Amino acid sequence: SIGKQRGLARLADEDGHFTMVALDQRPPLLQALAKARGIPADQVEFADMLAAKRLLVEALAHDASSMLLDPNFAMPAAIDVLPARTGLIVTLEEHRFQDTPGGRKSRSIDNWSVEKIRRVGGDAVKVLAWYRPDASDEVLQHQKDYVRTIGAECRRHDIPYVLELLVYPFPDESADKRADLVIESVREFAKPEYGVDLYKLETPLPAASLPPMDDSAESRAAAAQFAEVGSICADAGIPWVLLSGGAAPEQFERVLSYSYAAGAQGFLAGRTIWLDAVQNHFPDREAVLTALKGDGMKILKDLGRLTREKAQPWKPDFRLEQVDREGAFSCAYA
Amino acid sequence: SIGKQRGLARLADEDGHFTMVALDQRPPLLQALAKARGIPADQVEFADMLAAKRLLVEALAHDASSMLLDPNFAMPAAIDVLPARTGLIVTLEEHRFQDTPGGRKSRSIDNWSVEKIRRVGGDAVKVLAWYRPDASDEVLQHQKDYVRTIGAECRRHDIPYVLELLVYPFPDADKRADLVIESVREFAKPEYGVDLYKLETPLPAASLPPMDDSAESRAAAAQFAEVGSICADAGIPWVLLSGGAAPEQFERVLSYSYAAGAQGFLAGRTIWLDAVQNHFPDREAVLTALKGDGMKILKDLGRLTREKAQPWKPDFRLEQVDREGAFSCAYA
Amino acid sequence: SIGKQRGLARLADEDGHFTMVALDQRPPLLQALAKARGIPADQVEFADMLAAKRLLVEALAHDASSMLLDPNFAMPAAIDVLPARTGLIVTLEEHRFQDTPGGRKSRSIDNWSVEKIRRVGGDAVKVLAWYRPDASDEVLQHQKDYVRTIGAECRRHDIPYVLELLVYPFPSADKRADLVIESVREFAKPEYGVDLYKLETPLPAASLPPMDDSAESRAAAAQFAEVGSICADAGIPWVLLSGGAAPEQFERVLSYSYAAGAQGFLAGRTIWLDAVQNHFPDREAVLTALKGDGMKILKDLGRLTREKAQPWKPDFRLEQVDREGAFSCAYA
């Protein structure tokens, strides 16, 4: 359990805040580069995927406590430009899930593993599990076994397990119906058997629907859904960060205000920072950097300000067993 | 070898310098605590070893790019107070070496390994190998094989291989320079997989003349140039161990070494020995003595390092990837 | 503070629950009697109002820890049939409020006062204040001043101050919840001297979903918990007005309220309206209708309170006395 705490510490900043940037995007980045070139998604070159990810790391690493890269694209594109003090979270789930009529089934990226993420000097493993509690028993069971098996792998190599949960529509409704799917998904994977060390959660209520954060009845009703998530994570002892979901900067700031009031320890900013910077200017390197250092970095710095002011600091718990003899530590760390 | 490059970058500061602090002392700390407690070394409680290492890590952490910790004492004592952005080098060699008439033999700490250092979130593995080129053939084959197997273990777990080399007397200045340099040359061979060297000065610190345009200085600088040249050809950055010299002496040693290509230092016992021995267990008295001497020395070595040391740079020479999946297949 | 504590204890049962019954209805009972007699309300004889109040006190005094009586109708009508052990809360507000465009303005019943309620043997004083936070500054200034002046009367006579708050329309469920909750927050301030709160549901009774683990339930419970929080911080127990909601709906409002900390209820019109309206003045037929409906409702409400409501406990928190005479000197 030492490597898990030391790992999480390398994902948080100096003051214990998770101000993380995500760039493991496989389909969302392919559609962003296809728009920027006018060509269909299936015509985007591999070299373009590497150039876009290399640009996001150089431009955004120095203001991210930690970054999420995928093995096939972001790693060979930008590992040499990822600063040593920036934390490295590595994606393990494969973007090509199975869209069965009973639900979505997940699997790891081929020829990539928790063992390799640990070997390459990674600080954490990230798995995204598509989940909805009302899925078929076959889908629910497959997702559970996959999440639990990666948990066992992360416990074996003592490395933080970052689990991202996302709801989705079945092939071919309400804000309260959606909060029940989100919240119960969090409740399920907070169980000790899954070995989750950090959560990457979506908002249980739509960002657009959120009212201003004041002592009003409407705001109090919304805050109750966040309070429920905060309590599930606090009882399991798992910190939670919030994924942007492509909501507007104004909206994602409001999601973070309700989340931070409920206990959330940070964010994971994806498309919300760089989607427009890439789409509107690729392949012009200097034009992409002007939007990333300008407007995109503004969003990042503003979110870090709200995080520093309102997010409760994450603190490690090295609840080490009492060693009172020379040699007992080496024997106990097995 | 992305892990080796990334792990080496985690041992250096943002400028590329290695300003390391060694806190893996096992017998020297026990001796310092026997004198602090006024008792025999075999009577010092394990709690005092943890207490000493915990205040040592807390006090020195902010003036070190990386710290060297031993597993049995420094790790349970201070893993929670070692900053997240301070590099963590874990010691692997056993302090109890075998003192044979033909030379010293080395081994790993029992129930500890490269895999465990990689598991725990270590940034690099450290092995000190006692070496003399004139030791018996049995001792030479034992020392060479031990260095080589840890090299294979580190290549297997893609973790940087830090190797410390030290000469010693057999059980009873140019000769010592020959022992040092020929030891550096041997373990610079590719079979050993060394990523960073921790070396003692090839010429005695006290005998070193001022760094001027004189013949005496050129003769001295030539030994450092030979060490520098061996390491540059092998692609191994080298840092120097303080070795017990006075502050002005080690500064001069660093000045000759940095001119030869050295990329940093390793500050050992001398930073804190007097502070611990004179004031333990009074925590504040130790911290106060530390600030007035040892911590000042470390700041001076850091300003000297960023002034004269040539920066180290991560050389990622990865085979260019052309398709999705090629990276995952290649990293095998 | 002793009298307020003893007075509150006498409004609750020996378990600590407020199973209160409201019998201070003036125009609602007049309308019920006009419908029973088949005559206009302005033709209803004063003796019918007394016969109705007297009927209701004898009937409901069995299942009520305390009763709310009005001075001009209930007091002459049924003080002799109100059991000594049933607490007596006496109404002070005039039913004829001033219906201004900027909001409703309240006043005390003419020739009735807090001094008289204390004198006659009353356990508590009750004031209903029509309140909206968005009413005109003049109406707000009038209501705040009236509530505060009765709170001062109650501190002077050391008698409990029961304040009932009600929203009204000028001449969305979240918009009503803001009017209700912010009204509770204003009169919970220490300057008002409120001892017990009689509150309406912040969210409509019909709208309330089942008390399960759904998001729909947590959102509804949040409004109840804000009311429960404002009242626990001020040290004011809160009960709930039935407000004409159907029995199943009131039991649901009570489950949400009791989870937030409510200590009881006040049952109004619902209990007896149809019974009196349909059978008055046939005394027996009224009691027979009451037994099959209203009395059954009250038994269920009392049972639900015994199981789910938190018991109110008296906190005398008296300053310690060390001498004979100190208590008499300190109570002034």
Side-chain angles (χ1 to χ4, degrees), chain A residues 2-4 6 9-14 26 46-47 50 65-66 71-73 75-76 79-80 82-88 94-96 109-112 116-123 155-159 316 318 320 322-331 333-334, chain B residues 2-4 6 9-14 26 46 50 65 71-73 75-77 79-80 82-88 94-96 109-112 115-123 155-159 316 318 320-332:
Chain A
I2 296 174
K4 280 168 183 301
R6 180 151 192 90
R10 285 176 173 187
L11 304 195
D13 69 18
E14 200 172 287
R26 281 137 301 160
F46 180 77
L50 309 192
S65 66
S66 171
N72 291 323
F73 301 98
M75 287 281 286
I79 198 56
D80 60 293
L82 178 63
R85 321 301 136 198
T86 308
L88 173 62
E94 165 56 43
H95 61 280
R96 303 161 180 90
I109 291 182
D110 295 321
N111 314 308
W112 195 247
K116 281 184 190 194
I117 297 173
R118 170 56 97 206
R119 195 188 304 138
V120 86
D123 300 303
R155 297 215 262 218
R156 172 182 193 89
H157 298 281
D158 196 10
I159 188 172
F318 282 87
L320 267 160
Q322 260 278 312
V323 172
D324 39 83
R325 189 184 59 91
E326 181 199 14
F329 177 91
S330 293
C331 281
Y333 194 67
Chain B
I2 292 176
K4 281 168 178 293
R6 180 146 187 91
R10 284 193 172 178
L11 304 184
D13 63 31
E14 270 98 324
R26 289 143 284 163
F46 185 78
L50 305 181
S65 64
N72 291 323
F73 296 105
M75 287 287 298
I79 201 44
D80 69 286
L82 174 75
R85 310 307 172 181
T86 294
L88 172 55
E94 178 44 43
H95 70 264
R96 301 166 188 87
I109 290 170
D110 299 316
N111 311 305
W112 193 245
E115 171 177 16
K116 291 193 171 184
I117 294 165
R118 174 52 98 209
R119 262 225 296 288
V120 82
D123 294 303
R155 292 212 247 235
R156 171 178 193 92
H157 299 282
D158 203 0
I159 194 165
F316 283 89
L318 33 85
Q320 260 44 56
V321 176
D322 314 298
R323 51 167 287 264
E324 173 190 11
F327 180 85
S328 297
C329 281
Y331 194 68

Side-chain angles (χ1 to χ4, degrees), chain A residues 44-71:
Chain A
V44 170
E45 280 218 12
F46 180 77
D48 286 351
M49 290 290 285
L50 309 192
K53 283 157 184 269
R54 178 168 194 88
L55 275 166
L56 314 171
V57 173
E58 296 168 296
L60 308 165
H62 303 286
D63 258 63
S65 66
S66 171
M67 259 161 42
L68 173 52
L69 321 194
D70 62 287

Side-chain angles (χ1 to χ4, degrees), chain B residues 222-239:
Chain B
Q223 314 303 336
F224 294 90
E226 181 70 355
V227 171
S229 157
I230 293 167
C231 304
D233 291 4
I236 308 168
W238 54 298
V239 316

Side-chain angles (χ1 to χ4, degrees), chain C residues 76-89:
Chain C
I79 196 51
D80 64 273
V81 295
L82 178 75
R85 307 306 177 197
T86 300
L88 172 61
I89 312 172

Side-chain angles (χ1 to χ4, degrees), chain C residues 48-59 73-74 76-81 283:
Chain C
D48 281 356
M49 290 278 269
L50 312 181
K53 302 284 191 154
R54 183 173 192 91
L55 238 188
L56 307 175
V57 168
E58 296 168 333
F73 300 96
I79 196 51
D80 64 273
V81 295
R283 179 182 191 269

